[PDB]
Ligand binder design. Structure first.
Ligand code: 9M5
Ligand code: 9M5
Ligand code: CL
Ligand code: NA
Lengths: 306, 305
């Protein structure tokens, strides 16, 4: 019992974090086999930040312009290349702590763990979600660039996010590990702003199912709804549309609890209308949207508290 | 910018988790130097659990009745003893991944990270607080016993919690690493219950400072109060008393933000008496009490390990 914002154990990622320095700029890199991955903006100077030409900046660098430090050990850079917005530094040593891993690009609504790092050293771990507006609501200070997000379902580390920048509202933007940004953002200082964000409806529904599994039913009601009527209401509260794909992926939770998906949708409609009237759900007075259906099944019992 | 519920990096503890099996029971142990620590109730059968005599059960066990697995390697047990509610299994090999560590007993209101494990395998990490009623609001399923809680300082891991049991309300009870329970609980299937809990006032104040640092200021006001006046309000709302030591500990955050503690207490007084009037603080509609002053300073300043 209980229900927490739960991250993956971070040790397999800690063993890959290194410090990368170019010029006066230091940030974090990810050391996998004989490659170090980091944000390409490590090669920018103070006058280059509005409109850097990264191809022109990189051709002026030699391998020995990049200082890579793994704990106390300096690694020797023997090659470099750029892939989209990520720099790849080939080093002369394969990381002996490289885990089984892959690179995955995620979709909005998906969750992942973040290992926040400074100067190549880990600070803390927390859970995040890719928001519908392609930002993440992280906790990141100056020097955190190159920190990564990941999942570890089944002993393989899936890296899905590398941190690049903070936007004016205090939320965060970055890339997959192939260097492609999430959303319309660019690694330039030119003015950029997140779009209006929305609530991840399928995740709210997953979390209401988690509450039922853990023994709470006060918010249920005798009603149902059609899918289209639900979406007409939910969008008036800045909720994302619920698709038939979402209905399908909620099937297992629906079967475990005996509550049809569109019946739970009718409960959510009433909660938006009424509030909680001084009650809480799983320790929150707001509707939580950063737990996915997969997360709920990973954390909750397979036996409903009836 | 931003403020999250943040755990310590768990790698130093992951390398210490093992699987311990006795009879039909499998749970988790902590392997440090040449000793594996786990809950003593691993030796109980279902009948034993109703009214157990732990010394009697242990003398009939031989070292080979304890199966200890580090990954896919069996460790050989060469001795066994009990300390309070913890079993200590001496093994023939020192853990090469033992970190610098200490055992510490924490106070109510202090926070720590939990590494939830099953079958000796780390599964998740989250941040908790020791509640004033000496429970923790964890997330634990069957098989989680022996999971541990910890803090880190530079390179030293301070272990403070070992998980033993769930209570009927779904909160959790356990021991320090010397086997002393937190709270008035016992490791036996008998009627037990969490007591009425209270809110950790000094931690709520710390989180209001975190909010100000992150630009959330709507709850600030021109007023101040006194420790005596505020504590009469705290008692009314089942908040823990605020001491002068708590005020002193918040001093750095008061200097950084320009809001004296008793000034912030007047904000908290008004939030308790009036609510949030539909607004949120750091993305919460409740007053959060599982960040300590130290946690706020650490996350807002980027301390590494
Ligand atoms: C251009 C300007 C305003 C001077 C600036 C601002 C912030 C940084 N960032 C520092 O890390 C950092 C280090 N020293 C000072 N700032 C991060 C940042 O947004 N990435 C920049 C790279 C892409 C172009 C501009 C943004 C950062 C900070 C906090 C949290 N996440 C990331 C860098 C430059
Ligand atoms: C039969 C009974 C009394 C209802 C029971 C309940 C739970 C367990 N516990 C299993 O881990 C477990 C494994 N398989 C089945 N149960 C845990 C548990 O409370 N510890 C017991 C040890 C001390 C005596 C009683 C409690 C547990 C479960 C979930 C989360 N935290 C810990 C054991 C027995
Ligand atoms: Cl006043
Ligand atoms: Na005030």
């Amino acid at each position: 019992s209980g229900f927490r914002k739960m991250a993956f154990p971070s040790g397999k990622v800690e063993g890959c974090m290194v410090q990368v320095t170019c010029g006066t700029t230091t940030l974090n890199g990810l050391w996998l086999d004989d490659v170090v991955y980091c944000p390409r903006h490590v090669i920018c100077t103070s006058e280059d930040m509005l409109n850097p030409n990264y191809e022109d900046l990189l051709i002026r660098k030699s391998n020995h312009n990049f200082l890579v430090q793994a704990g106390n050990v300096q690694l020797r850079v023997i090659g470099h290349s750029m892939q989209n917005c990520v720099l790849k530094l080939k080093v002369d040593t394969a990381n002996p702590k490289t885990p089984k891993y892959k690179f995955v690009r995620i979709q909005p609504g998906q969750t992942f763990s973040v290992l926040a790092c400074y100067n190549g050293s880990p600070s803390g771990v927390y859970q995040c979600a890719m928001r519908p507006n392609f930002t993440i609501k992280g906790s990141f200070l100056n020097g955190s660039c190159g920190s990564v997000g990941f999942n570890i379902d089944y002993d393989c580390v899936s890296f899905c996010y590398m941190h690049h920048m903070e936007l004016p509202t205090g939320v965060h933007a970055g890339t997959d590990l192939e260097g492609n940004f999430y959303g319309p953002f660019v690694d330039r200082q030119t003015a950029q702003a997140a779009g209006t964000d929305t609530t991840i409806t399928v995740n709210v529904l997953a979390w209401l199912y988690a509450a039922v599994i853990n023994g709470d039913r006060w918010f249920l009601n005798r009603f149902t709804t059609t899918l289209n009527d639900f979406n007409l209401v939910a969008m008036k509260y800045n909720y994302e549309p619920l698709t038939q794909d979402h209905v399908d992926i909620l099937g297992p939770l629906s079967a475990q609890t005996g509550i049809a998906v569109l019946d739970m949708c009718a409960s959510l409609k009433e909660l938006l209308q009424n509030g909680m009237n001084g009650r809480t759900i799983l320790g929150s007075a707001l509707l939580e949207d950063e737990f996915t259906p997969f997360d709920v099944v990973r954390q909750c019992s397979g036996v409903t508290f009836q």
